[PDB]
Design a protein around this ligand. Structure first.
Ligand SMILES: *[C@@H]1O[C@H](CO)[C@@H](O)[C@H](O)[C@H]1NC(C)=O
Lengths: 50, 50
């Protein structure tokens, strides 16, 4: 009696590798926050009047 | 009102016009002060009271 792995084996199937799409996490990103846009002005009427 | 016309003389004429208006007040956090529609600042919390 001999084991099943003692004889050479050939794959009769046509392998098809399937790599699922990895999960992705999106982080917040802004070129200019609303605070930066407000600060872009040279003068602010609110602060000047205050 | 202005003074009556008297030759080569300076005159002072006072005018007092009572005015009452309904203005929209605005305030921001910490709400320690508020502004008026006329652009005048009021350094008092809108909720101040006894
Ligand atoms: C992936 O597919 C290939 C054939 O494209 C196959 O040879 C391989 O054993 C499969 N599995 C792994 C883990 O690479």
């Amino acid at each position: 009696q001999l084991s099943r792995a003692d004889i050479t084996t050939v794959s009769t199937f046509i392998d098809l590798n399937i790599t699922m799409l990895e999960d992705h996490e999106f982080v917040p990103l802004e070129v200019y926050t609303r605070h930066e846009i407000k600060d872009s002005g040279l003068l602010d009427y609110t602060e000047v009047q205050r | 009102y202005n003074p009556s016309r008297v030759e080569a003389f300076h005159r002072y004429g006072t005018t007092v016009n009572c005015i009452v208006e309904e203005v929209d007040a605005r305030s921001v956090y910490p709400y320690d002060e508020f502004v008026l529609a006329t652009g005048d600042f009021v350094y008092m919390s809108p909720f101040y009271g006894y």
